[PDB]
Design a binder for this molecule. Structure first.
Ligand SMILES: *[C@@H]1O[C@H](CO)[C@@H](O[C@@H]2O[C@H](CO)[C@@H](O[C@@H]3O[C@H](CO[C@H]4O[C@H](CO)[C@@H](O)[C@H](O)[C@@H]4O)[C@@H](O)[C@H](O[C@H]4O[C@H](CO)[C@@H](O)[C@H](O)[C@@H]4O)[C@@H]3O)[C@H](O)[C@H]2NC(C)=O)[C@H](O)[C@H]1NC(C)=O
Ligand SMILES: *[C@@H]1O[C@H](CO)[C@@H](O[C@@H]2O[C@H](CO)[C@@H](O[C@@H]3O[C@H](CO[C@H]4O[C@H](CO)[C@@H](O)[C@H](O)[C@@H]4O)[C@@H](O)[C@H](O[C@H]4O[C@H](CO)[C@@H](O)[C@H](O)[C@@H]4O)[C@@H]3O)[C@H](O)[C@H]2NC(C)=O)[C@H](O)[C@H]1NC(C)=O
Ligand SMILES: *[C@@H]1O[C@H](CO)[C@@H](O[C@@H]2O[C@H](CO)[C@@H](O[C@@H]3O[C@H](CO[C@H]4O[C@H](CO)[C@@H](O)[C@H](O)[C@@H]4O)[C@@H](O)[C@H](O[C@H]4O[C@H](CO)[C@@H](O)[C@H](O)[C@@H]4O)[C@@H]3O)[C@H](O)[C@H]2NC(C)=O)[C@H](O)[C@H]1NC(C)=O
Ligand SMILES: *[C@@H]1O[C@H](CO)[C@@H](O[C@@H]2O[C@H](CO)[C@@H](O[C@@H]3O[C@H](CO[C@H]4O[C@H](CO)[C@@H](O)[C@H](O)[C@@H]4O)[C@@H](O)[C@H](O[C@H]4O[C@H](CO)[C@@H](O)[C@H](O)[C@@H]4O)[C@@H]3O)[C@H](O)[C@H]2NC(C)=O)[C@H](O)[C@H]1NC(C)=O
Ligand SMILES: *[C@@H]1O[C@H](CO)[C@@H](O[C@@H]2O[C@H](CO)[C@@H](O[C@@H]3O[C@H](CO[C@H]4O[C@H](CO)[C@@H](O)[C@H](O)[C@@H]4O)[C@@H](O)[C@H](O[C@H]4O[C@H](CO)[C@@H](O)[C@H](O)[C@@H]4O)[C@@H]3O)[C@H](O)[C@H]2NC(C)=O)[C@H](O)[C@H]1NC(C)=O
Ligand SMILES: *[C@@H]1O[C@H](CO)[C@@H](O[C@@H]2O[C@H](CO)[C@@H](O[C@@H]3O[C@H](CO[C@H]4O[C@H](CO)[C@@H](O)[C@H](O)[C@@H]4O)[C@@H](O)[C@H](O[C@H]4O[C@H](CO)[C@@H](O)[C@H](O)[C@@H]4O)[C@@H]3O)[C@H](O)[C@H]2NC(C)=O)[C@H](O)[C@H]1NC(C)=O
Ligand SMILES: *[C@@H]1O[C@H](CO)[C@@H](O[C@@H]2O[C@H](CO)[C@@H](O[C@@H]3O[C@H](CO[C@H]4O[C@H](CO)[C@@H](O)[C@H](O)[C@@H]4O)[C@@H](O)[C@H](O[C@H]4O[C@H](CO)[C@@H](O)[C@H](O)[C@@H]4O)[C@@H]3O)[C@H](O)[C@H]2NC(C)=O)[C@H](O)[C@H]1NC(C)=O
Ligand SMILES: *[C@@H]1O[C@H](CO)[C@@H](O[C@@H]2O[C@H](CO)[C@@H](O[C@@H]3O[C@H](CO)[C@@H](O)[C@H](O)[C@@H]3O)[C@H](O)[C@H]2NC(C)=O)[C@H](O)[C@H]1NC(C)=O
Ligand SMILES: *[C@@H]1O[C@H](CO)[C@@H](O[C@@H]2O[C@H](CO)[C@@H](O[C@@H]3O[C@H](CO)[C@@H](O)[C@H](O)[C@@H]3O)[C@H](O)[C@H]2NC(C)=O)[C@H](O)[C@H]1NC(C)=O
Ligand SMILES: *[C@@H]1O[C@H](CO)[C@@H](O[C@@H]2O[C@H](CO)[C@@H](O[C@@H]3O[C@H](CO)[C@@H](O)[C@H](O)[C@@H]3O)[C@H](O)[C@H]2NC(C)=O)[C@H](O)[C@H]1NC(C)=O
Ligand SMILES: *[C@@H]1O[C@H](CO)[C@@H](O[C@@H]2O[C@H](CO)[C@@H](O[C@@H]3O[C@H](CO)[C@@H](O)[C@H](O)[C@@H]3O)[C@H](O)[C@H]2NC(C)=O)[C@H](O)[C@H]1NC(C)=O
Ligand SMILES: *[C@@H]1O[C@H](CO)[C@@H](O[C@@H]2O[C@H](CO)[C@@H](O)[C@H](O)[C@H]2NC(C)=O)[C@H](O)[C@H]1NC(C)=O
Ligand SMILES: *[C@@H]1O[C@H](CO)[C@@H](O)[C@H](O)[C@H]1NC(C)=O
Ligand SMILES: *[C@@H]1O[C@H](CO)[C@@H](O)[C@H](O)[C@H]1NC(C)=O
Lengths: 601, 48, 600, 48
């Protein structure tokens, strides 16, 4: 089933009517269910809108305004769910669709078998050239049809007479395009909607918009959930209550609830909880992996601190991080949802009186290792030439994407380098980096080391030329490998040859030289136990961990270990002139000098 | 047309665009600068 | 509704037909839902059965066998649920209800409202006076009507047809007494049952009986849960899944599932889990109490020793603790369900080759602290005079009851005292203690103090006379308060007037006398730190636990407390063993606060 | 009547009662002693 996301422009538009039409094609061409609004605005008198005929269901509102075309080809739209309303009031709003000086405008609405609106008002007004719209009995389509509640039907004259084959309430001037009543003609014994005037014509309680027959498998739209070809109030769960034993018992046909559907397994980016697939687990429980499945259970007395992201939880209404909400991130290591920086967040918002962010507040994000949604940077303070405030970020979770993108940077002129250090995974979605006219080191990056599947892509265009950056000496440390680098620092390369010492890449390790001694393997070097005496002039001191694996210790030798005093603790022991411990008679805890009690002090 | 100049309480309503006031609905809308979308033109257009 | 438990006797009976009739009145009189089987056996032809007219629902099977009476007055019986079946096959078994040398037996079935049998077969066989039942069509009533199910009627001279308006299918000679078909006459558009032949006459799908209309709130009976008058497959839970946010969100309409009903509150003795009220949790979760409510959470690396009782879990098939299952209780501390001790469990059962319990084996119960169901003792080895094997038991839960009882002790002549020590609460149900003709501590116990609600009672019909027990000196230790005592020992008292040293009641504490010393607390005395000086003549030197609480000790006195030795910052001590800091540069010895006071 | 002597494999079927065999159904019926109830007469009666 083909699904598209829609728009949130209301009555705003692009600077050219040809670009406004091309955008409408790019958002709504070749799809049937909309996961948002349908917004058709400012379209000219002569355009091909036949691509909109595939739409069958709209999740948000349908807005049709300020256009000039004669016919609205919404020929398969059956149901509007109204999960978001125009002005928080209307699910369908059609207005001002005519040219003021001229004679163009919308004459016929189309709307072939629109039968259900599950929420909100209906507003049809100011549409100068419509013929039939004011004859339509909208109370059959709308639930809670009470006309005083947001049902503001207006708007024209000199037309609206029906064809002899339709008894009033016409959509158009012919034998077809007649409104069919689905609720107001049903028996007083009837539940919901019917396909005829009799009680035997009534359809199942979980169908919407009318039906082909009485069954939950045989109807024009579901409401609540679509259980694999049947409409239902809820899907079968992991456990059921046995009323004769008073306990919960495991089910045989359990399904996980997922969006408007039910599935046998949750997708790999969702968390399993109480027979449902959720985008985030509640803060009372820890997210864990068991047998490759993500799920969550109550946490221990001290557990990770996770913040709400932009567009989720306590920040559901936020569009960006700004000077009012940025203080919420002070000790978070994880962010649930998105992290977004728009021009209204960084440089303030004079309409709403929101202040600009002080560049020093942005150091608050240096504690975050994981973001579960996407990272979206469209503005950044002019004096911050890199992203070092995010250097500790490890993973971009990608559980939600911005138009398919999980890492998104556009138009940052005041940047020279990126300087991420801990970043190793970009788990889902595409990377989109454009218009960064002063950015250099980006061109070196081996992005297949960060991608989690071969299905991921990156888009790069109109950034600073790599040839100009090379000419200026914009290059990383000589140890840096073919994987590339985030910035000029010896600790800012994706991978390096020889050895590293924490984040910093190094040419050699302290095995036989310098202030301390260590041992090396697999491009890593770490100190051996400080009991081992430092060897000089090229002689190796240590070749493994502990007080073991070295040439000798300055302490007293005792098997694989050494001690400060040979008789300490302990069996009892004494030491020889080379500080090696040997057995002594028991007790003697004041001190011993040889193998027997006669050698005790 | 169907709109006039924005009232003073909307002076800064739109960002990187030109504000217009729809008289029949008493509601501002904005015509965005090249490459910008959204109700106040505050977001960059990925399809540009 | 009026709810009563059913009997499970099958074809077995009492030795006296007057007691058989009186027992039948006491179980089934003035109740409408039978929470078990309805079994009517061996009743005489002269008896009044009009009290059975209150029965509307049976959760198990109905058995009518070997009886003499003419008419079975179950006219308003509607549904049989078939939870258990007779011989594991039948939900309704009616057979042999006549005397073959004489002329008495069952003639007319009543049963007019019987509409749904949800599970099992139907068995009508070898009656003599029952003539009408051959006409009835059971496949409308039986939920599983197909030939693979045992639905059968076996003979008499006949009784014509009931009335001209009845097209066969009838119980007795009137237009009032012919069968309402509810399934076989329904329109093919409808699932389940109907109240007429038309699609407009069909019932709501989630109903089992007849209906007045196609509604979940307007049908006579149903096979699923009762959500405040509506019959439903599931009822509203604590959270609802939001299909646009992909999150679980709180439900203000939520109800708990409890048995066959949806309720707002779960009773105090049940544990709440996943929007339901249940008897016990899975072995991976622990019961906890938060805000006065018991609920379950996943357990950590140490989990309680939850243990299967009789009638649940791995022992669901068991009737008693016995020699084949007693080993399952060895390291158990909390038992889910019951402990039941019958004659077969103690003295053996040769019919199944199960040997008697060796009395010593009963010590596996010494570790039990809580029983979540009931305790039922009807047999005990003759060699034991008490129940001291349960002395560690703290609580009886009462989540399941034996005919309303949670503690039941019948006919134990070997017992002279009970000897519980730890038992403090009986959370639900009544107490029934009788026929213990040698037991002398039943009447001294303040039994109301063990109850957790005003609705609990104790019944004691007969035990040893209180005047005879007094004459023998069968009284508790002098320290014991008016709340009474489990046996003769000072430690078996429910509560003592003077302080207790743990479980042992004493006249006075070792505050300032004896070889060890104690401090007072509200009804107990507890030992002080061993460093503290054991002073004479009323000089108590401690006021609670710890070396800091002592007024004078034989060891070193540091800042916060008395210690056996002070640290090597390094400290020195004066001639009164009072400790003070040394110069920081000390390792081997010290006698003062400055560098020249340090010793090597 | 309907009853006969119990077959050998039912010798210990009844506990505190007398065994009878119901011939038409090839099944035992146990008659309980004073104050006893149950399919095999194994439980004490709470009413008496
Ligand atoms: C207005 O409302 C109508 C309903 O009143 C909506 O109609 C839907 O239209 C689509 C097509 O656009 C229908 O889908 C097709 O249905 C055919 C039905 O065939 C007969 O059999 C069924 C059996 O149940 C009868 O109900 C029906 O009356 C017919 O007698 C199928 O034959 C089609 O499948 C075949 O063709 C395709 C071609 O690609 C092949 O892929 C298939 O393998 C197969 O060979 C197809 O399924 C849909 O059924 C209609 N729905 C309803 C509710 O009836 C309109 O969408 C709506 N708008 C407009 C503009 O009319
Ligand atoms: C309850 O949920 C189920 C899914 O569980 C929904 O099922 C959808 O059913 C509709 C039809 O009612 C499908 O839509 C159309 O299907 C035609 C047949 O092809 C499909 O089926 C074959 C196997 O039989 C598959 O191999 C194939 O991939 C398809 O899935 C297509 O011909 C139609 O596509 C054509 O028209 C559209 C424009 O309308 C063009 O964009 C296409 O390019 C093409 O020309 C169309 O796909 C739909 O696909 C089903 N979905 C799923 C997931 O299977 C029920 O509809 C739903 N019920 C309710 C009431 O909500
Ligand atoms: C983000 O999380 C960090 C921790 O990871 C929080 O930082 C801690 O905040 C607490 C707040 O109480 C600090 O505790 C207080 O510290 C004061 C300074 O202590 C430092 O300096 C002395 C110098 O001698 C050192 O000994 C000490 O180890 C510290 O390095 C103390 O003066 C305070 O004592 C007073 O208050 C307590 C209150 O209980 C009284 O009991 C005392 O008697 C006394 O009156 C107090 O101990 C703690 O130091 C901070 N830790 C760090 C690492 O900085 C952030 O607050 C948190 N941010 C948010 C917004 O949640
Ligand atoms: C000084 O430096 C040396 C390295 O130079 C370190 O040596 C390591 O010592 C550890 C033990 O402390 C070794 O680990 C153990 O190895 C056992 C032998 O199997 C390995 O070697 C054979 C050689 O033929 C190989 O075939 C085989 O594949 C293995 O590589 C294993 O039996 C041990 O695991 C089993 O036992 C433990 C018991 O607790 C169980 O927990 C396990 O589940 C398992 O059943 C274990 O793996 C290690 O191999 C040594 N490394 C090397 C390179 O030799 C010293 O540790 C270091 N000094 C100090 C103080 O640490
Ligand atoms: C076999 O099965 C049938 C069908 O289920 C049972 O029918 C029930 O009959 C009784 C007695 O008539 C009904 O109980 C009474 O209902 C009155 C309400 O009116 C009913 O009838 C009209 C049509 O005449 C319907 O429109 C309406 O919906 C009702 O169904 C109440 O007012 C009565 O209450 C008064 O009397 C009682 C007497 O005890 C007092 O306690 C009250 O205080 C009050 O004064 C009474 O409730 C019952 O509703 C019928 N059920 C149905 C579903 O029809 C048969 O009873 C059953 N067979 C036997 C032998 O019982
Ligand atoms: C879902 O759950 C509800 C309850 O949780 C069930 O409804 C109950 O049904 C029982 C049995 O009919 C009712 O019990 C009766 O209580 C009467 C009290 O009077 C009030 O309630 C009745 C409603 O029946 C009103 O008519 C009356 O005006 C009062 O408001 C007693 O008077 C009754 O005793 C008499 O009738 C019984 C019938 O069983 C006779 O045996 C007695 O001899 C006596 O004459 C009776 O005990 C109970 O009140 C109902 N509760 C309510 C009102 O909700 C639903 O049936 C259940 N749904 C299903 C079928 O799943
Ligand atoms: C010998 O040892 C005994 C103990 O066996 C010592 O007795 C002390 O007795 C005093 C009272 O006389 C105790 O003080 C009170 O404790 C209450 C409980 O506090 C604990 O529990 C809560 C549980 O949530 C914790 O939050 C809390 O941290 C403690 O762990 C408090 O509620 C009381 O506070 C009230 O009273 C004070 C009075 O000054 C007010 O300031 C407060 O605002 C409030 O109104 C109070 O603190 C004390 O705890 C006992 N100590 C011990 C060790 O248990 C003897 O003192 C000791 N003798 C010698 C010689 O050392
Ligand atoms: C970017 O990083 C990726 C991932 O580490 C590098 O891809 C790797 O490319 C090498 C060379 O082609 C592959 O090794 C070769 O594989 C073939 C398989 O048939 C084998 O015959 C050769 O002997 C050799 O082993 C390697 O598999 C491949 N890794 C993955 C995961 O695809 C890539 O080189 C990096 N690019 C740069 C320039 O940094
Ligand atoms: C010398 O080589 C060893 C490895 O042979 C290096 O140390 C060890 O590296 C392994 C990975 O190669 C680590 O194992 C991983 O540990 C994490 C712990 O959370 C676990 O999630 C992974 O599944 C995996 O088991 C191991 O922890 C690590 N050990 C230590 C002590 O760091 C070592 O760094 C090399 N260099 C030197 C100089 O020691
Ligand atoms: C047996 O146990 C019961 C239940 O714990 C005890 O009954 C309790 O009697 C006390 C007597 O003081 C009641 O307290 C109060 O008594 C004063 C008397 O002036 C009265 O004014 C107050 O209204 C209040 O009743 C207490 O409430 C009562 N508890 C119950 C549940 O009834 C009884 O004392 C124990 N021992 C004996 C010897 O029966
Ligand atoms: C003096 O006697 C009183 C009783 O009169 C003792 O009070 C008891 O203190 C214990 C301390 O553990 C309380 O236990 C509670 O256990 C739960 C277990 O989950 C825990 O969550 C609580 O924090 C608490 O520790 C107990 O409730 C309390 N009993 C009463 C009746 O208040 C006290 O300990 C005695 N003092 C000495 C010095 O012996
Ligand atoms: C408790 O068990 C003991 C056996 O362990 C019983 O004592 C036996 O009693 C018989 C009576 O005829 C004597 O012949 C035996 O010599 C006794 N044995 C021992 C070891 O003393 C005692 O009767 C049992 N008590 C009860 C009440 O059953
Ligand atoms: C590259 O440098 C040349 C001069 O060498 C200059 O003409 C050109 O504009 C530079 N390009 C960029 C992208 O800076
Ligand atoms: C009470 O004791 C007397 C002897 O003093 C005895 O005759 C009588 O049977 C005893 N009664 C009981 C109940 O044991």
């Amino acid at each position: 089933q083909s699904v598209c996301a829609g728009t949130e422009n209301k009555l705003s538009s692009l600077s050219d009517l040809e670009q406004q039409y091309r955008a409408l094609r790019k958002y709504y061409e070749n799809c049937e269910v909309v996961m948002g609004n349908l917004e058709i605005t400012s379209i000219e008198h002569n355009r091909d809108l036949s691509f909109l005929r595939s739409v069958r269901e709209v999740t948000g509102y349908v807005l049709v305004a300020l256009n000039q075309f004669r016919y609205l080809p919404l020929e398969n739209l059956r149901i509007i769910r109204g999960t978001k309303l125009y002005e928080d009031r209307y699910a369908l709003a059609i207005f001002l669709n005519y040219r003021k000086d001229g004679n163009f405008g919308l004459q016929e609405l189309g709307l072939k078998n629109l039968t259900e609106i599950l929420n909100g008002g209906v507003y049809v007004d100011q549409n100068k050239f419509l013929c039939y719209a004011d004859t339509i009995h909208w109370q059959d389509i709308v639930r809670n049809p009470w006309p005083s509640n947001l049902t503001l039907v207006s708007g024209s004259s000199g037309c609206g007479r029906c064809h002899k084959s339709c008894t009033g309430r016409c959509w158009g001037p012919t034998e077809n395009h007649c409104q069919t009543l689905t609720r107001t003609v049903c028996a007083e014994q009837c539940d919901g909607r019917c396909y005829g005037p009799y009680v035997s014509d009534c359809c199942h309680r979980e169908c919407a918009g009318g039906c082909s027959g009485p069954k939950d498998t045989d109807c024009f739209a579901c409401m609540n959930f679509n259980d694999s070809g049947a409409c239902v109030t809820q899907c079968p769960q992991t456990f059921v209550y046995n009323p004769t034993t008073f306990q919960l018992e495991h089910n045989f046909n359990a399904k996980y609830t997922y969006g408007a559907f039910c599935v046998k397994k949750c997708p790999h980016n969702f968390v399993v909880d109480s027979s449902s697939c959720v985008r985030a687990c509640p803060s009372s429980k820890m997210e864990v992996e068991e047998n490759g499945i993500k799920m969550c259970k109550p946490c221990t007395d001290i557990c990770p601190k996770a913040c709400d992201g932009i567009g989720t939880g306590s920040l559901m209404s936020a569009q960006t991080v700004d000077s009012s909400n940025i203080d919420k991130f002070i000790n978070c290591t994880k962010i649930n949802g998105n992290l977004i920086f728009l021009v209204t967040g960084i440089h303030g918002d004079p309409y709403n009186a929101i202040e600009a962010i002080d560049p020093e507040k942005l150091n608050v994000f240096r504690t975050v290792r994981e973001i579960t949604g996407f990272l979206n940077i469209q503005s950044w303070p002019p004096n911050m030439t890199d992203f070092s405030v995010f250097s500790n970020l490890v993973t971009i979770g990608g559980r939600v994407l911005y138009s398919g993108l999980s890492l998104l940077i556009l138009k940052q002129q005041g940047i020279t380098s990126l300087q991420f250090q801990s970043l190793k995974e970009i788990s889902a979605g595409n990377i989109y980096i454009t218009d960064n006219s002063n950015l250099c080191y980006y061109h070196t990056i081996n992005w297949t080391t960060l991608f989690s599947t071969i299905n991921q892509r990156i888009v790069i265009r109109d950034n600073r030329k790599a040839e100009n950056c090379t000419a200026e000496g914009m290059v990383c440390n000589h140890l840096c490998s073919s994987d590339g680098c985030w910035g000029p620092g010896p600790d800012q390369c994706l991978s390096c040859r020889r050895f590293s010492r924490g984040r910093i890449c190094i040419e050699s390790c302290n095995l036989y030289d310098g202030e301390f001694r260590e041992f090396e393997n697999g491009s890593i070097c770490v100190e051996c136990d400080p009991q081992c005496e430092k060897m000089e002039d090229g002689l190796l001191t240590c070749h493994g961990p502990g007080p073991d694996n070295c040439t000798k210790c300055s302490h007293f030798k005792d098997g694989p270990n050494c001690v400060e005093k040979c008789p300490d603790g302990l069996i009892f022991k004494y030491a020889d002139p080379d500080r090696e411990c040997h057995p002594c008679h028991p007790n003697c805890t004041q001190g011993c000098n040889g193998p027997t009690s006669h050698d005790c002090i | 047309g169907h709109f006039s100049r924005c009232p003073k309480q909307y002076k800064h309503y739109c960002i990187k665009g030109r504000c217009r006031f729809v008289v029949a609905e008493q509601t501002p809308s904005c015509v965005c600068d090249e490459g910008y979308i959204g109700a106040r033109c505050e977001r960059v257009d990925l399809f540009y």
